[PDB]
Amino acid sequence: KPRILNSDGSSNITRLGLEKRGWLDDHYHDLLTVSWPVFITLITGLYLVTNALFALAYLACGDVIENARPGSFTDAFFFSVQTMATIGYGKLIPIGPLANTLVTLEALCGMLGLAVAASLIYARFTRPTAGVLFSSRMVISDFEGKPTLMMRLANLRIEQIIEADVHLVLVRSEISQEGMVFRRFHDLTLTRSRSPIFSLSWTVMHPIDHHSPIYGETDETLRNSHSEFLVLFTGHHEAFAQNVHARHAYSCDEIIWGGHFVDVFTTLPDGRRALDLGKFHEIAQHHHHHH
Amino acid sequence: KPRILNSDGSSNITRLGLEKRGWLDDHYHDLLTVSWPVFITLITGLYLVTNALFALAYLACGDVIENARPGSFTDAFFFSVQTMATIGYGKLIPIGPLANTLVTLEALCGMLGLAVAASLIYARFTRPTAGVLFSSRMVISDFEGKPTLMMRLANLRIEQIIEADVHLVLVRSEISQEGMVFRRFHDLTLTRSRSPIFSLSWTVMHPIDHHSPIYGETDETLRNSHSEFLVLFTGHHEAFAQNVHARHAYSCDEIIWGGHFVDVFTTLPDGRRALDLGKFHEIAQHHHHHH
Amino acid sequence: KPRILNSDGSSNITRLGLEKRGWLDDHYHDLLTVSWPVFITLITGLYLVTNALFALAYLACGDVIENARPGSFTDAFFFSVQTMATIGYGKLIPIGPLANTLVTLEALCGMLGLAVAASLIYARFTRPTAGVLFSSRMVISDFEGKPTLMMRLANLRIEQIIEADVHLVLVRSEISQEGMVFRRFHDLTLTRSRSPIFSLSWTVMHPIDHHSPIYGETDETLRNSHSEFLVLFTGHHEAFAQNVHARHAYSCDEIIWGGHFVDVFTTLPDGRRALDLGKFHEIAQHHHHHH
Amino acid sequence: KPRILNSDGSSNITRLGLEKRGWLDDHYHDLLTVSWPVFITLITGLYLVTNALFALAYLACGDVIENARPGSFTDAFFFSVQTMATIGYGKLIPIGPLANTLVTLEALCGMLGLAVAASLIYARFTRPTAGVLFSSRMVISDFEGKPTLMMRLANLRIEQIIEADVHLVLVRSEISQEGMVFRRFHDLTLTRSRSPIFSLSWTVMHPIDHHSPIYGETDETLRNSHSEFLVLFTGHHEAFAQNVHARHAYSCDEIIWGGHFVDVFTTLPDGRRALDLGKFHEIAQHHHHHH
Ligand SMILES: [K+]
Ligand SMILES: [K+]
Ligand SMILES: [K+]
Ligand SMILES: [K+]
Ligand SMILES: [K+]
């Protein structure tokens, strides 16, 4: 069967045809999703193709610019870069009314061009990534006398995330009395969804009790309903002093029945007590005697 | 009867005044509610008419501006545009004390002008709109063996909204023991008010059970209390990595009794599984045999 | 008796002696609490007394500045304003090493001076006031068969506040088994503390039931315990697209026993249905036949 | 035994790596954790060494810069500082194509340099610290006829913190039926975890009742499980009109059994009613008669 939700928690559902688009959305992804090196280019290019134009625009007025060359674009281009950046050496001042007036316009442009450039540079500086690692598998094993759906996540940074909240949601196809078959979401009660200070590792646990949406359920029954599990994480990072988000999705076949995450708090004294994320996806299992 | 609440959730009540108004409110709507093209004008005009004034202010000092023309506004205007944007080609330097002093003043003006012009450009850049679509009607039909008040909303963009919250509120006129008739608000319990990842479509449902404020009601009883329904949606948008929200209101005559929304996750394989918002306001109903 | 809490919800408690102070606190009240006109001054003054200094600093190097006058402060001052604002007409360029080097320093100054000026101008633009009016009195009258502590608040603006939360807290002196007398806070359950869309008026109500901290309490008993009531309001304003806060405090003698707020939704058709805040503090009472 | 949690709530666990690091994290601590005086250096240096380079880059083009000195770095350096800050006196204008081209580049650099320099100045300006003081010890004494775990915190500033939230968490080593020994976290219910207006002092209390994770425990049993207590405080600060938070941790040997904090609201009339934080860490204890 196909994955409804990818592993990164992204919907694999197709959307239908043209209809819609916004700007703070438009003027915001292509410009704030690409790596800085890319971003700088996207602005360096914009920066130059605006000058080059105002340069064309100048030369389009004649031999206006004072002390420049006749029709030389590599003389008007420079006048713009000196006019827009509000540098104005003076040695190349505008001439007449068309120029001067175009100036008041080019500089105003480089003004907002500074503002905009600044807004963006800040929107970006404020889209902190979570730095949260999710275990590659899930497991269902006994804990405190009950079968327990588990999974864990770790902080890949030395800065603390405070007020961390984890949501573990079951998503399967069900059918109602009205015989209607629908996709449904279930908020699995975790023995702890709020963690005051997320610093190192955290194992989220769902005790499968008579009150659980997956009570008396097996790998088979789960697959039948095309069961999937979504995990959303959020918290206030201390590093950026801002909010942070992270999600991941699991499939039925990513659940190791009988598994046990191996202890990551591997305290090896000879220097200090530590945490090892090298063992983070490690899962213990009991194998049964073949014949 | 009239609509207490408009379709977009805006109150249709009249307010009585001549009293009070603020500034971060004043200096914020007329300036941050209008489309960018409009916004640009509102600043392009403020830009020039301040220059134009400072030009008037210069000429008013006499034949001061060195290397300009006598009383020519079309020469002092350009000096301001050159002084404010802090360009200063030099060929038109100030003259004396009144000028220079006016300069240190004009330039400072264009300074904050940059600041202000920046704050704004940012405030705006951060008032994301939520592209949430609300269905034109509501429906009361059976779901899980119970009459259920339903309505739905869709994400008009490809970006995901994290931590979505919907509130469906009944607002009607009631009467207390003290014989007082008051407009009351009722928070209807939904079979689910928090959505982890609002990605495609969502049908909000209110099971009308013996605990419901509309239990045993009918279109007639609902109209009598002049019942209305308000819906508030909020969520963290991944596009702008910011918060977003939306509201909408419905009246009694917008509730199709017996209706069923038509499935939108119209999976037409031959390419992929999808979602169609063309069928979003589509409601199925049983028609009774005429005689 | 003295007011522990003023009417605006401010503590009237004295703090003891010197010890402590921060900067984002220092560099933040004196500069962001004063009215804009004041703010502009505080920056206009800073702006000038920095130039005037760099001017002194220049003249302190000798007859350096080119094309200026000997020892004339009203010639170096202007050089700074032309150097800091990064204008640089050129006609007065620096001279030697001390000057030029001082320049690289003055301009860098006017740089951060732009940044800082910008940060602040934005912090300010983002300290939205609530615009929430609290009724001057409180009342205790029957509602739905029970004695009910009430009070109301109104939105003094045409923009909606969404997700409004009101907290009504009783604060009195109590004594424990250990015979210890302490000041205590009580969260009074309101028949509704969360309001999805605060637009016009809202009457907060505390049903005094056997579960109430003021059950079987009288004006006298309340005064004895020096009872006070605090009300905190918060919500997401749509206007500034930011959070908003407002608080107020009431005394025992600001509670009208037997009172009834008068209806503010005074619907006078002949034009439309309205809201009148002129009647907001109006309270009805039944007077008893004197003899 | 060692402290799993430091006094300031920082984890004292070792992390194992050579793996991963980010940028809005990189370009954010070394740059936004250091005191302003330090911050100013970190930029004043970056400012000059970029200028100095562009100077080297110019001279590397030969005797280009018009009106300068042959191969003199102390002439091209000043040209950059004049080109970057977009000053451009003009007397030192670029020369040819390599220069001018380098200009449009340098100036653009000083542009973003302004942007970046601005974002940062703002990020910082918005990482408010909470001036919350935590008591050095905790105490378990009787309150309302029950052993109660207590601790307290004070506001070190005159600004009010709105919507204060405190979480007091027990963290100890426990063992499950499956014979697994795990470090568990316990959210102790406080007789009050949310404070409307955190203005002076606050004594957080945990009634040790039959429902408490430390019911029937003793200093010895607590030490055996290597019990620790973590406290997280958060709130909206009115000073910066922003959010703030603080954490602190206590170990078993920091719990005074039988202790009582001494009253801090030391009301000494002869001027006014106050609060003394000099007695904040003051704990009273009964001493048993020696023989
Ligand atoms: K300039
Ligand atoms: K010049
Ligand atoms: K400039
Ligand atoms: K210049
Ligand atoms: K010149």
Concise overview:
The PDB classes it as metal transport. Four copies of one chain form a homotetramer. The first copy, chain A, is α+β, with helices and mostly antiparallel strands.
Describe this entry's structure for a reader:
The structure is a homotetramer of 291-residue chains. The first copy, chain A, has 291 residues and is an alpha+beta fold. The first copy, chain A, folds into two domains: 21-128, Helix Hairpins (Orthogonal Bundle), CATH 1.10.287; 129-291, Sandwich (Immunoglobulin-like), CATH 2.60.40.1400. The first copy, chain A, is 26% helix and 29% strand. Chain A is built from five helices and 14 strands. In chain A, strands 2, 3, 4, 8 and 11 form a five-stranded mixed beta sheet that branches. In chain A, strands 5, 6, 7, 9 and 10 form a five-stranded antiparallel beta sheet that branches. In chain A, strands 12-14 form a two-stranded antiparallel ribbon. In chain A, β3 and β4 (146-155) form a beta hairpin. Chain A starts with 13 loop residues before the first strand and ends in a 7-residue tail after the last strand. Chains A and B meet through β1, α1, α4, β6 and β9 of A and α2, α3, α4, β7 and β13 of B. One potassium ion (K) sits between chains B (88-90) and D (88-90).
